[PDB]
Write a protein that binds this DNA or RNA. Sequence first.
DNA 1: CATCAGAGCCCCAAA
DNA 2: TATAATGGGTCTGATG
RNA 3: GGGG
Lengths: 83, 176, 53, 1111
Amino acid sequence: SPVDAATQSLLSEELEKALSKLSEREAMVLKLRKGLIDGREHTLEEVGAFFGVTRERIRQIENKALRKLKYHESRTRKLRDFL
Amino acid sequence: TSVYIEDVLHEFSTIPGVKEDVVEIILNLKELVVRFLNPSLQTVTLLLKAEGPKEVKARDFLPVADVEIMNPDLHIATLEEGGRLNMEVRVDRGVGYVPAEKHGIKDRINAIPVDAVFSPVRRVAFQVEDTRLGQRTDLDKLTLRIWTDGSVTPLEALNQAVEILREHLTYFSNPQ
Amino acid sequence: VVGPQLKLHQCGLPKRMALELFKPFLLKKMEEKGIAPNVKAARRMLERQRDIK
Amino acid sequence: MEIKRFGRIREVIPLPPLTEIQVESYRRALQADVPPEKRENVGIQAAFRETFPIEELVLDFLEYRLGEPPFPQDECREKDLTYQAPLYARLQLIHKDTGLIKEDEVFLGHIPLMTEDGSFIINGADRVIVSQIHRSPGVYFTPDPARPGRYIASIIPLPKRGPWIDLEVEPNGVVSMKVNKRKFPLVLLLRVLGYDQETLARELGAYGELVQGLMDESVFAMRPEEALIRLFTLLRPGDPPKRDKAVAYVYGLIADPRRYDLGEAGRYKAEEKLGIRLSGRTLARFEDGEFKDEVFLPTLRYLFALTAGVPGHEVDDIDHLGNRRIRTVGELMTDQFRVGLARLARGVRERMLMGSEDSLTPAKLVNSRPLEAAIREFFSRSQLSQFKDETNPLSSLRHKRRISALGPGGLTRERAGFDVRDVHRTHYGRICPVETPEGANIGLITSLAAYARVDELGFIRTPYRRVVGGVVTDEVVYMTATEEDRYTIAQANTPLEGNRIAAERVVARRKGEPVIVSPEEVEFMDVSPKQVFSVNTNLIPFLEHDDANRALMGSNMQTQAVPLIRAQAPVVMTGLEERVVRDSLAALYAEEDGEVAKVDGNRIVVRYEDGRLVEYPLRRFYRSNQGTALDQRPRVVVGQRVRKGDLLADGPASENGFLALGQNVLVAIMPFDGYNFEDAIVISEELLKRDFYTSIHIERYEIEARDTKLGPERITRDIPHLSEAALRDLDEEGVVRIGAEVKPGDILVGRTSFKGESEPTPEERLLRSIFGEKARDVKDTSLRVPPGEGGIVVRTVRLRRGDPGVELKPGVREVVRVYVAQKRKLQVGDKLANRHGNKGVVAKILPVEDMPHLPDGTPVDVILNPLGVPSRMNLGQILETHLGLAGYFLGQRYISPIFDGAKEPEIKELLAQAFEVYFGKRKGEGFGVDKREVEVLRRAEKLGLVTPGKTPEEQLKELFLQGKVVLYDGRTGEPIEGPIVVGQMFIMKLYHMVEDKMHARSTGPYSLITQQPLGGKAQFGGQRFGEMEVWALEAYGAAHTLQEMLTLKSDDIEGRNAAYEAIIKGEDVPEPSVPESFRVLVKELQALALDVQTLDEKDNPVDIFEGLASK
DNA sequence: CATCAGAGCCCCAAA
DNA sequence: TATAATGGGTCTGATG
RNA sequence: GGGG
């Protein structure tokens, strides 16, 4: 519907507001893990074959992104209602 | 302004042993005239309990200090053997007509908001008859006819009305 | 219903109808005043008749 | 209180059981209360005796029996079941080769039963089978329109039980016969009967133009079998004239009482019209070896003698109510029963020649299915099976006595013209001339007259009293429109000194036409003015003073009266307001004499004189089909001595046994600042204070929890992504608590359902993994309150798969129903009306201090506008108000019979007595006359209302006798310059309330193929901007407003999504793209091999599919 | 003289 | 997969 | 089958 197309095109907008504040590789391990690129969720195993890192720098690579994005919330408070 | 009846959840209910339904009992209640003696008393809560083959009238309400039931013979509900009534009516002082939808006054959870006809004046009329100060003719003799329920007497009403009026003429004071 | 008190260019529109009919406009105005913080929260407000202020 | 009643007509016989047209027809169709041996050959029995025996092995029918219903009426309404009875049939399989007889009783399914009030419960919904009216079976002679001199004979049988046969006499002088759209000399058919040229001159003989113009020689030169084989070829190009294939087809077509059936009425009609005796309901028969005729020559003899000037020969009026007959509920159902019995006989013969010709009981040879289907079909899909109109007791009573000319076997909206919808002079006493719809259906749907009764043959009869010499007998006689035409019938109000006709000249009818005749020549007298109109029309006081076009609207709107909580019977009645409550069975009466034991809001108990203690429970607050609250309240107290037939409880829209469709309000006829404009109505806020025009309404919300290939739905309370404020009124299971105020948006029943491969799309997974929580398995699908609905929860119903006595449709686990009530006060928009056709929407509710009040301070209730009276010509409301004015002060209600009620002198007498009460108390109470009353009198004097030179008392009384009174404006205190008509009027709140109709949509559901918005308020639809509304925008030249209507605001998926995003962002709407409904047009033309091309100005194709359709 | 195509709008609850 | 079974169940106006 |  128009309301859905609206909110789906406002979620992507208010999310690539997070590809910035993070970085280029941080905001990409999240894309493979959550499936933004291929549609399927690649484990910290397969992802290790795209940056060289093993299954525990990816974890800190991921958790640094999320924990940083969690602080970008409660300061922009945009993504709450988005349920 | 509100009614709670024991083991009654909503207005569309029915009570065992009670000839009337709740829609009618709340209608019979709406005609209750309750006068306050203390001026600064805004709200009370009248209690009633009955049983057996009683024909509960407005007397059976438990007596509250500084309140008087002005129409004690007001039929409330017929009860046959085994029938038990037990309620808590809220009575509020106010002005004009505030429909149940507007105030939603609930003391408990199963309280039923009732329509409030606050105004104590039942009927008003006035006569304008011809008179003379023998010199001059075609003068007017005004005769106001105030009927009331008894919570406020016709004279008190007349004074309050004149006061509301003079209070309103004062608004024409500071112009802009 | 007849509205004898209306100017020739006027009509009486129930506020309930006007809310739904202008809903998108009402959302943007609510965000611009502050009655809600983002347009998608404002739509959640108008969804329960009690939540409406 | 005192009930003065007028009228001098002494009504002998009273109205018949007003629902018998339904109750009697079906009881006679079924005969369940009759021992099988004693059953007459009609209805269900006659069907069996027509389908059986079955000739292969010969199966035969012995008797049927009806069992007791599986569930009581209330339990069928409650469980959405059909209130029905099991049908069994004892059959015996006689082997016509050995003689073996295996007998058994086979179960043929359930037959729906009719309830006490003559209605049905089909799937838990009350329904009514509307009687049908159609052309009667028989022989009809009607004049040729192409050829003025010659006529046409027609032989019409009962619907779908025989072909129409016409006997046109072609330009040639021998008589032709047109059957199944073919045509051929009737000479050939006549030879087949065995007719010899001598029996044509001998039997006929008298019209050498015709008797001898019919006899042709090439045809007579052949035996009855030689011609039977000539005609079998003239009617079936392809079949080979076998002498057992021709006698099988023709016998079945014309002589077989299984495919062809002149009804029982068709028999009588044809016998009388032709003056013969018909042995069977059929045109021919097969006796002794060949075909013996029965109808073909009598008909031919008549048709010929009416191309001369021979007596008794006369054309027929096919619209005469002696030639049209009613098909009641019994006949309508039995006809579907005969159809679902001929299919079961088809499956019997197919199993009787393949299987084991000796190993067959009746049980595994009879498959009920084709009979359960046909019956189930008549009651669910028939046009004559209507959702019952039970808005109030009168709604259902009118619904059941309704007559329709449309439906299966009758006409069609487009198939009907002027002739059928006219009021025929024979309607008099049988079909009400007023009750009928305004609009397309005018004259096609009608009502049975009040004293009218349908006879066994199906003709409507009306009662008439016998006049002998000049003495009127109490003997009553019911007549058909054909019997009636043989008598001079006097009018109901002809002056009678006892039992004698008092008048020198009496007003009578002779074949419907009005004639002035002497009492010597009078044979029958009307029984009452009530016998000419319907039941609704008979409820309009002062009907004789109303224009028919407005009396129709007043008749129909009574059906729409919503029952009110303070309902009251009118101050002016007609004397039917009790029989209507009685016969509608909404009230509750005493079976015998006795004393009342207990009385309660739920039940009454009556210690009858027989010692037996009977307990009548009381319908308490049950939702009707139209959602009005049917509710029975008690009207007796503990220990009251009640006689037989005494009222024990009022039904809805009933006050102490009298029909109460509305309220008696104090009305004032006068313009009021425009709020009165063009039929709108102004009302006092006092009406809402004393809960006048307040009605209860119940709406039922239903939800299913079903099994899915993705998981089970669950009626939980654990709804995701919510707050406890939203779930506060839900119980442990997730169902709203009984007694909670629900508003729009509120959850009524919590429900969850799992999602699909819509298993959170990454941009969602990324969002949830950011917020700590994890995407939930199931989603919120709870039942919420729709926009503009609400109320108080009064009952919840849970039915689950597994609990005892319940089983849902396949795949459904649980079903929950929540019933919400709402006490509805009057409000701006609600429609009101009186019994005279005056209808209007409340436009303004004034506070009591603005209402026009009487001099003694009494404010009026309603302000009608006088402009609604002259053009409409419904003065009955004017008299109703005048007599209502008197009753206001005398404290009386009046019974004023129709065409025999209170007349103006009599009314004035009551008003004069009333003036003493209105003014008499004043002049002793210490008050003289008012200054402004004098000013008004000064203007009344100029208006010719009062006599100059009388005291103010004599002049106010003169105005009072005209119904006018002095009226003070409440806003000024100054008088209305003129005296205004004021009095009590009976006004009804109609079922059409703004709360039902207010609807608005921003965006919502779109339709599958077109991508255009759904319709209807229930679907949260959009409004239709049809052809004419587009023309309106074109005529304005509003190009962009129209373009937006055809794109952004409908089916331009691109533009309509983009528009919304611009409006929530504050950007002006975008320019529209192509409407998706045009792409559907292009693709549906490609589906027809047609290549549609959108081109530019260089004739180069333009893609409106954006490359998604090419390879 | 046969065959085909037309025969007002919008809205409701039902199914 | 092998007794034999063989033919069904209105209402008007325009155009060839 | 109701409404206008």
